[PDB]
Amino acid sequence: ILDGPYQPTTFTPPIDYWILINSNTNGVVYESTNNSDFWTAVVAIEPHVNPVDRQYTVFGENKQFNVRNDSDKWKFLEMFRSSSQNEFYNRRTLTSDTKLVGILKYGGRIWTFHGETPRATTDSSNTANLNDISIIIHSEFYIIPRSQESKCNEYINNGL
Amino acid sequence: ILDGPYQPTTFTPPIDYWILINSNTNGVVYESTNNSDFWTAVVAIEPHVNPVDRQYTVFGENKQFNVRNDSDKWKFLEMFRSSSQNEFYNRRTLTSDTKLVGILKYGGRIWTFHGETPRATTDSSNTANLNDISIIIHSEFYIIPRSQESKCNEYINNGL
Amino acid sequence: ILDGPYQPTTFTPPIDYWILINSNTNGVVYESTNNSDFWTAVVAIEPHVNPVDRQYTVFGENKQFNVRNDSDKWKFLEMFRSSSQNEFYNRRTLTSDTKLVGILKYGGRIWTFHGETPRATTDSSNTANLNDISIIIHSEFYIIPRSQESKCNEYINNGL
Amino acid sequence: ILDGPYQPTTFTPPIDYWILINSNTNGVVYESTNNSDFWTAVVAIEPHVNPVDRQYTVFGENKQFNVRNDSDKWKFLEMFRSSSQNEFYNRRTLTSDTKLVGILKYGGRIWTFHGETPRATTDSSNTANLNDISIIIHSEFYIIPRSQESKCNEYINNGL
Amino acid sequence: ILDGPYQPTTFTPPIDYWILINSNTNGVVYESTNNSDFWTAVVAIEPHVNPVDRQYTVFGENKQFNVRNDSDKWKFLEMFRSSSQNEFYNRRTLTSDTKLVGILKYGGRIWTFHGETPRATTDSSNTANLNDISIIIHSEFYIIPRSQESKCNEYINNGL
Amino acid sequence: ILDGPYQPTTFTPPIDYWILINSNTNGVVYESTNNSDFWTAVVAIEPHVNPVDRQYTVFGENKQFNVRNDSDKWKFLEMFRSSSQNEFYNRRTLTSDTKLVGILKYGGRIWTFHGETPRATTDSSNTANLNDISIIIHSEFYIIPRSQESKCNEYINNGL
Ligand SMILES: CC(=O)N[C@@H]1[C@@H](O[C@@H]2O[C@H](CO)[C@H](O)[C@H](O)[C@H]2O)[C@@H](O)[C@@H](CO[C@@H]2O[C@H](CO)[C@@H](O)[C@H](O)[C@H]2NC(C)=O)O[C@@H]1O
Ligand SMILES: CC(=O)N[C@@H]1[C@@H](O[C@@H]2O[C@H](CO)[C@H](O)[C@H](O)[C@H]2O)[C@@H](O)[C@@H](CO[C@@H]2O[C@H](CO)[C@@H](O)[C@H](O)[C@H]2NC(C)=O)O[C@@H]1O
């Protein structure tokens, strides 16, 4: 009953659906924005990376992020800014060996998974415009209704 | 000169184009909403279905609808609501053995086909926000300019 | 304990507060918009006016509205559009002999009063961006916390 | 060269300016929020208040705060939350016999004064969205450019 | 029918309205910015001023501008910058014996008056963020709908 | 490093990315609009076409465009209108033997290439609503961050 996988693409995710992205390299996993007050780009950091500066293309710009991962698992860094003039900061991190990342539009808020598998949990971010948040997804992904969030959770924490 | 077929997808359909969906199973054919005053999901009922409660995923929720089909043809039920806190009701039905369903954004209204093939006709639904109506399409579809609605009509009623 | 009256002005009302406007003429009571998907202007119609076209300045434009009022009470018509390209239509009406109109930003929605006093009730309207909805208020007005909505209700239906 | 006084009002303070509020009663001095990750309301406690629960209207809600002041001077309590679903806590206090409080948007942070006059100093609070922080001010206030912060400091600690 | 005068204040002007400011001294007439790509401050230069450096407080900072006026009329100089990392340059000038200055948010641009009365004309400046354009006005001002721009032009060039 | 090719589709291009379209026939290359103040359709004219009216389907309607190409290269005609009530006119032309056209949403404007390869240059068109500009693309295309605009320029003028 798993809807997918879908090819990398740019679209406005519908309300009340988890987008479950299967990361496949150490680059930008997705870029999300409404172009007013919400910019989040997730970068994937492979295990055992001493702190270092890396260049990522994010929202059409070349940006330098200092990056580290002292874990056996991958680390997916949520880099956030609320205006094109602010610099990004690492707002949240998901530490995972399943390499799946989740994003949901629900209840006026953006929900993502953070923590460390197999015990990662959801967290919310506010915005003045949830409906207009669009996403560029750089890997294969799946769509899971919120009615089946418990399944998505399981996937996030245990793999497909 | 038929534009398509395109793969299942989520997007905001352009104004003044018929979306012509070729249904392939007895589930949700498409879901359309502007998240303000218009929600429509079309469910496909195969021929000769005694009254029965069926579960469907619509706008991320698990909804139960009682459906029936006493016909030799398929029945495509428009489940409609005008508020996110209302339940759905069966607003229109397309009885068809071509299994093609159509939806058009035009003149401030949403136009669809209803009735029974080969004599299905267009009907309109009002909305205060036509431009922000988006759609999730669960099967292959085609795009037809409104300038060629006659052709679309033909297809709806007679198939490709 | 009533906060006000405040002079006519343009501002972005804070979340979770009723704005209570004391209309004083048969013109535009207020104009509210986020400049993306929500435009509401309220026009005041004095009692016993046979249907007639009248010119109003709304959102910087000269608009002609056909208005009628058979009642002995004033009629406050909510003219709404979701796009600067659409025509306004009369979305709601508050029939009142107190000349008080209310607007509240709460729960992701815009709440106003409609119906006929002293039995007027609240109703909501959806938007993709509630926070950025600003208002031009053409009369004296008061600010009442949502915690005291019952008082606001009394005011709307009974006068100050 | 002192810009003010201005009347109580709600607005989005410009970046790089101190708002200097002259408190005149033992109520809410101001309410400040961006509706995403920052809510501060300052309550004024008169001298010699034994520990007591007091009700205040903050951000449209009735809240009950435990307050106390055993000093000869007034206490201005910053009640803070970073999420609408958290209850407030007393994050900072300004103990003052000048009854002047200050708030500034600058360098990605909110700056206020705390400590005890005439030795009160500035302190910062972080936010993901500085530009959308607005304020409701319940008494007269002045605008001072950050270029003249020394003057503001003087006033905070010594009066006008 | 002229809406005003209003007292000096800080606010976000509504889209599609001229703000008509009656300058009353040789200082900063107004400051406008969206804090992303648009900063404009108009300075008033009395007649017969030899080229000289003057200090102005703009956007909370002390800035030195070299100003001149060899005419019998007042000169209003637009100092502009497209980034907080840049210095201001004199982008436009309005030469006027009426001491009225105009600014309008419309069509994705900021419109002002320039040239010399009674033959001043409008011109536009681009922005990517018009909705966030806020203004500090240091003199009395009026609000004129764009539908009455001719009248505004009249005032600009001839006085009230 | 080149992102693509992607299949013909309808979507809202992200801000700050060049869409680089590889035209493959003498039809409509793309259609772009926000349904408020911006409509552009690019039509491809093969070499050596005498001035003639040709029929194209744009934005769901049949239109006749006066078209010509007296050169050895292809010509890509931008047909533009600022309102649905206006007729299209040839606003710009790109004369090219690479058959690549470019469109970018940036800085409150739409940027395209015009002129003649290998010295085609970018030009801008204003809009009040850049976020809502969507595109129907009728051939394979690539996405190039604005940070790599030079590479896009190279492609435009010299091919892949
Ligand atoms: C004044 C009014 O209500 N006009 C209706 C019109 O809506 C206008 O369409 C304009 C087109 O851009 C514009 O948007 C304007 O703002 C609108 O008021 C339409 O809704 C038409 C519908 O015509 C019907 O179209 C469907 C779909 O193609 C066809 O299947 C129907 O056959 C067709 N009906 C008729 C009688 O032609 O109605 C009003 O003209
Ligand atoms: C965090 C950082 O890199 N710098 C801090 C700085 O913030 C920057 O300010 C820039 C303004 O030109 C620009 O906005 C940049 O993007 C920011 O990173 C400031 O936050 C200062 C704090 O300066 C303090 O300001 C308060 C309020 O005026 C004063 O009361 C303090 O006395 C003052 N302290 C100091 C040491 O200057 O901190 C970082 O430099």
Side-chain angles (χ1 to χ4, degrees):
Chain A
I1 47 177
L2 188 50
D3 193 0
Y6 295 93
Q7 292 310 289
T9 191
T10 300
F11 77 120
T12 312
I15 295 295
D16 208 43
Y17 285 93
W18 280 100
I19 318 296
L20 182 66
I21 304 167
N22 191 340
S23 177
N24 69 347
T25 190
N26 61 337
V28 182
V29 180
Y30 71 84
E31 297 158 64
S32 192
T33 187
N34 58 10
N35 299 294
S36 53
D37 71 349
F38 182 94
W39 282 263
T40 181
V42 168
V43 291
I45 317 309
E46 70 273 24
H48 305 306
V49 170
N50 294 307
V52 65
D53 290 336
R54 283 175 178 172
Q55 302 235 301
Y56 303 95
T57 297
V58 282
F59 302 108
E61 292 170 29
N62 196 21
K63 281 290 188 184
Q64 214 200 47
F65 293 155
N66 178 263
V67 159
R68 63 162 132 168
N69 179 16
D70 60 353
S71 165
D72 279 6
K73 306 171 184 173
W74 288 70
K75 274 188 187 284
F76 300 97
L77 279 40
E78 260 181 54
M79 312 297 293
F80 177 85
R81 76 185 171 184
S82 68
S83 88
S84 53
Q85 299 300 306
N86 294 4
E87 280 306 323
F88 292 92
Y89 70 96
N90 188 6
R91 188 166 172 180
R92 307 187 183 80
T93 304
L94 170 66
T95 310
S96 166
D97 58 351
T98 74
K99 304 199 285 192
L100 297 164
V101 180
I103 173 163
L104 158 72
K105 294 157 77 163
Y106 179 77
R109 302 172 163 231
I110 287 280
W111 301 84
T112 50
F113 277 86
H114 81 310
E116 187 165 356
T117 55
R119 307 211 89 79
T121 60
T122 65
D123 202 12
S124 72
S125 297
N126 278 314
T127 171
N129 197 325
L130 175 72
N131 292 1
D132 286 355
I133 287 187
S134 59
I135 195 174
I136 305 181
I137 303 172
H138 296 294
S139 305
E140 276 194 331
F141 66 96
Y142 309 82
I143 314 305
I144 300 167
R146 175 166 143 79
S147 68
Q148 297 283 357
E149 171 160 332
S150 71
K151 199 59 175 174
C152 177
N153 189 301
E154 191 187 356
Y155 290 139
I156 283 278
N157 283 300
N158 296 303
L160 303 172
Chain B
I1 48 170
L2 192 53
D3 192 351
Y6 297 92
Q7 280 307 99
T9 195
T10 297
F11 75 122
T12 298
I15 298 294
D16 203 38
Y17 285 96
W18 280 102
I19 311 308
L20 182 71
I21 305 169
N22 182 7
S23 176
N24 61 4
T25 184
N26 66 342
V28 186
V29 181
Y30 74 84
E31 310 152 76
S32 186
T33 185
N34 57 14
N35 285 286
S36 59
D37 70 354
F38 180 93
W39 283 257
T40 184
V42 162
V43 293
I45 318 299
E46 76 272 20
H48 303 305
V49 167
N50 294 321
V52 61
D53 278 5
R54 284 184 179 169
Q55 304 212 103
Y56 306 91
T57 293
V58 292
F59 304 103
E61 302 182 13
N62 182 65
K63 283 293 180 179
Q64 172 172 108
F65 298 138
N66 192 270
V67 302
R68 65 186 293 169
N69 188 356
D70 302 317
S71 170
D72 277 315
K73 303 170 178 173
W74 282 72
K75 278 185 182 295
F76 299 95
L77 282 36
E78 272 176 34
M79 314 276 91
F80 172 80
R81 76 181 174 182
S82 61
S83 149
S84 67
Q85 279 137 259
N86 288 1
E87 297 294 336
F88 293 91
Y89 72 92
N90 183 23
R91 181 173 176 179
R92 303 185 185 82
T93 297
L94 173 58
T95 313
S96 166
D97 52 5
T98 72
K99 300 193 302 304
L100 296 175
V101 185
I103 182 162
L104 156 77
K105 297 159 66 172
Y106 177 77
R109 314 190 231 160
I110 288 284
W111 301 80
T112 60
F113 283 82
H114 78 312
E116 178 179 357
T117 56
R119 306 172 68 77
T121 58
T122 57
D123 195 20
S124 73
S125 304
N126 288 345
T127 172
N129 191 341
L130 183 66
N131 294 342
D132 295 333
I133 291 187
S134 60
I135 198 175
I136 305 175
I137 305 172
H138 295 284
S139 64
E140 284 190 327
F141 62 100
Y142 308 82
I143 319 292
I144 301 175
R146 196 184 83 96
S147 67
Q148 312 174 170
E149 174 162 325
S150 60
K151 286 285 302 167
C152 185
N153 190 300
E154 182 178 359
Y155 294 143
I156 287 279
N157 281 304
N158 296 283
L160 312 171
Chain C
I1 329 175
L2 194 43
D3 199 339
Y6 296 92
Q7 295 311 295
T9 188
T10 292
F11 79 123
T12 305
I15 297 289
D16 208 32
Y17 285 96
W18 278 100
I19 309 304
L20 184 63
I21 307 173
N22 183 9
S23 176
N24 64 340
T25 191
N26 65 339
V28 178
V29 179
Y30 71 82
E31 294 158 60
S32 194
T33 186
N34 58 8
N35 288 291
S36 68
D37 71 355
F38 185 99
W39 279 263
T40 302
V42 166
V43 290
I45 318 297
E46 76 265 23
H48 302 313
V49 171
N50 297 312
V52 60
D53 287 345
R54 279 177 183 176
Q55 303 285 138
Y56 304 91
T57 298
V58 292
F59 305 105
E61 300 172 12
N62 192 213
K63 277 315 189 178
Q64 170 175 295
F65 297 150
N66 193 258
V67 297
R68 93 192 310 271
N69 184 5
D70 73 72
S71 170
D72 290 79
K73 315 179 179 189
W74 285 72
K75 277 192 182 299
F76 300 97
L77 278 36
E78 284 189 27
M79 312 296 305
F80 176 83
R81 69 185 179 185
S82 70
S83 162
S84 42
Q85 274 34 245
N86 288 342
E87 275 308 335
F88 288 95
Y89 79 99
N90 181 20
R91 181 165 174 179
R92 298 179 186 92
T93 299
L94 171 60
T95 300
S96 162
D97 55 3
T98 72
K99 298 176 194 168
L100 293 170
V101 177
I103 177 162
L104 158 76
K105 293 157 67 158
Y106 176 79
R109 297 186 188 90
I110 290 284
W111 297 88
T112 54
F113 278 85
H114 70 126
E116 190 178 355
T117 59
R119 315 168 64 249
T121 65
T122 69
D123 199 16
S124 75
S125 308
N126 264 314
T127 175
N129 190 334
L130 177 74
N131 290 2
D132 292 351
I133 279 179
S134 54
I135 195 171
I136 306 179
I137 299 166
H138 296 290
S139 306
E140 284 198 318
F141 68 95
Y142 306 79
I143 296 177
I144 299 171
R146 189 184 168 259
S147 63
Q148 308 183 331
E149 175 159 327
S150 72
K151 315 273 151 293
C152 188
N153 189 306
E154 193 184 348
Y155 287 138
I156 285 276
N157 284 298
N158 297 308
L160 294 174
Chain D
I1 52 178
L2 191 52
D3 198 349
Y6 298 88
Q7 288 316 105
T9 193
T10 296
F11 73 124
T12 301
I15 300 285
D16 210 30
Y17 285 93
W18 282 99
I19 313 311
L20 182 65
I21 306 170
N22 190 7
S23 169
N24 57 9
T25 187
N26 64 338
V28 177
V29 179
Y30 72 82
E31 306 187 348
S32 191
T33 188
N34 57 18
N35 284 306
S36 63
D37 69 351
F38 183 94
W39 285 257
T40 299
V42 168
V43 289
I45 318 297
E46 74 268 18
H48 300 306
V49 170
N50 294 322
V52 65
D53 271 22
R54 281 183 181 175
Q55 300 206 22
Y56 303 92
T57 296
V58 289
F59 303 106
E61 316 187 77
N62 286 345
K63 286 294 175 173
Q64 183 170 88
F65 296 149
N66 258 291
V67 306
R68 66 186 143 115
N69 180 9
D70 61 357
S71 168
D72 286 343
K73 308 172 183 175
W74 285 71
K75 278 185 186 303
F76 299 96
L77 278 35
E78 281 184 37
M79 311 295 294
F80 175 78
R81 68 181 178 188
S82 64
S83 155
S84 64
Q85 310 157 311
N86 295 352
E87 292 290 345
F88 293 90
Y89 73 94
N90 180 25
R91 178 174 181 174
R92 286 182 204 89
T93 297
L94 176 67
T95 301
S96 166
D97 52 15
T98 75
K99 287 189 285 190
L100 295 173
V101 307
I103 182 158
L104 158 75
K105 293 160 59 156
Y106 174 79
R109 283 133 146 77
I110 291 291
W111 300 84
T112 61
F113 281 87
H114 75 320
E116 180 165 355
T117 62
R119 296 152 197 271
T121 65
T122 63
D123 198 21
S124 70
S125 301
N126 300 344
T127 174
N129 193 337
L130 180 68
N131 292 342
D132 290 328
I133 284 167
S134 49
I135 198 175
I136 308 170
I137 305 169
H138 299 294
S139 62
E140 273 192 336
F141 66 99
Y142 308 83
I143 320 280
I144 301 170
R146 195 184 83 92
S147 63
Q148 304 173 9
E149 167 163 325
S150 63
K151 300 288 196 303
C152 189
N153 193 303
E154 193 181 352
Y155 298 146
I156 286 277
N157 283 303
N158 299 276
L160 314 155
Chain E
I1 55 174
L2 181 56
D3 190 356
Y6 297 91
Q7 292 313 109
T9 191
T10 296
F11 79 123
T12 300
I15 302 292
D16 213 27
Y17 287 86
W18 280 102
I19 314 304
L20 181 66
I21 303 167
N22 194 350
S23 175
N24 64 359
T25 195
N26 66 343
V28 179
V29 177
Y30 73 82
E31 281 176 17
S32 183
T33 185
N34 59 11
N35 285 295
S36 68
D37 67 0
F38 186 96
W39 281 260
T40 189
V42 168
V43 294
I45 318 303
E46 73 266 25
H48 304 308
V49 171
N50 296 317
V52 69
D53 277 353
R54 282 179 176 173
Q55 309 260 288
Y56 303 91
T57 305
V58 297
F59 306 104
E61 296 172 351
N62 213 264
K63 289 292 181 185
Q64 182 163 268
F65 300 147
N66 205 263
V67 303
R68 55 177 290 260
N69 186 354
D70 71 52
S71 76
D72 293 326
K73 303 185 183 174
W74 282 75
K75 279 186 189 311
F76 301 92
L77 277 44
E78 290 185 24
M79 310 302 306
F80 173 79
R81 79 189 174 175
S82 59
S83 153
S84 43
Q85 306 179 18
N86 304 152
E87 281 298 329
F88 292 93
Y89 69 98
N90 181 19
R91 182 164 180 183
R92 307 180 182 84
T93 298
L94 169 65
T95 303
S96 167
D97 56 8
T98 73
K99 301 186 301 191
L100 290 166
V101 162
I103 179 162
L104 158 77
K105 295 157 68 167
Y106 173 76
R109 301 146 151 158
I110 295 280
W111 298 82
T112 56
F113 280 86
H114 76 297
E116 184 173 350
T117 57
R119 324 272 298 202
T121 68
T122 60
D123 195 30
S124 67
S125 307
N126 181 72
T127 178
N129 185 6
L130 184 69
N131 295 340
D132 284 354
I133 292 279
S134 192
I135 197 169
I136 304 175
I137 304 172
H138 295 127
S139 304
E140 287 196 320
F141 66 94
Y142 307 82
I143 319 296
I144 303 174
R146 195 179 79 95
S147 56
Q148 299 176 19
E149 170 165 324
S150 63
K151 276 289 153 176
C152 184
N153 189 293
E154 183 180 342
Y155 301 142
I156 282 283
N157 280 304
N158 300 285
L160 312 165
Chain F
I1 53 172
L2 182 52
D3 192 3
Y6 295 95
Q7 290 311 107
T9 194
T10 301
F11 77 123
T12 301
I15 303 287
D16 211 31
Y17 285 90
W18 280 101
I19 310 304
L20 179 67
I21 307 171
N22 187 21
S23 173
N24 60 357
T25 197
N26 62 345
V28 178
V29 183
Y30 72 81
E31 303 159 79
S32 182
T33 189
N34 55 14
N35 294 304
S36 54
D37 66 0
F38 186 95
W39 282 261
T40 185
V42 167
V43 293
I45 315 312
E46 75 273 23
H48 308 304
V49 173
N50 298 321
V52 70
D53 274 355
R54 275 181 184 181
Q55 301 226 154
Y56 306 90
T57 294
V58 294
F59 306 103
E61 296 172 358
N62 274 186
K63 294 288 180 181
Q64 293 189 23
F65 296 145
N66 179 359
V67 152
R68 84 181 141 91
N69 185 351
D70 73 343
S71 78
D72 295 321
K73 303 176 182 176
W74 282 72
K75 282 177 179 296
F76 299 90
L77 277 44
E78 281 182 37
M79 306 300 302
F80 172 79
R81 79 188 176 185
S82 57
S83 148
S84 59
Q85 304 114 69
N86 298 354
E87 265 311 324
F88 295 90
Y89 64 97
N90 180 22
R91 181 170 183 175
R92 297 180 187 84
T93 300
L94 172 62
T95 310
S96 167
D97 55 7
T98 70
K99 304 204 295 183
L100 293 162
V101 304
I103 180 162
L104 158 78
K105 292 156 66 167
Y106 171 74
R109 304 162 163 138
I110 296 284
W111 298 81
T112 59
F113 284 84
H114 77 310
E116 183 178 349
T117 60
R119 303 161 260 282
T121 62
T122 62
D123 198 26
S124 69
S125 307
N126 183 73
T127 178
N129 181 4
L130 182 72
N131 292 339
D132 283 356
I133 289 202
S134 62
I135 195 174
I136 308 179
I137 304 168
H138 294 305
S139 70
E140 279 190 326
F141 65 97
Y142 305 85
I143 303 182
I144 297 171
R146 194 179 77 98
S147 57
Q148 302 172 359
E149 168 159 328
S150 59
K151 259 303 176 167
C152 187
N153 192 302
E154 187 174 17
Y155 296 141
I156 284 277
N157 280 304
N158 304 286
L160 313 168

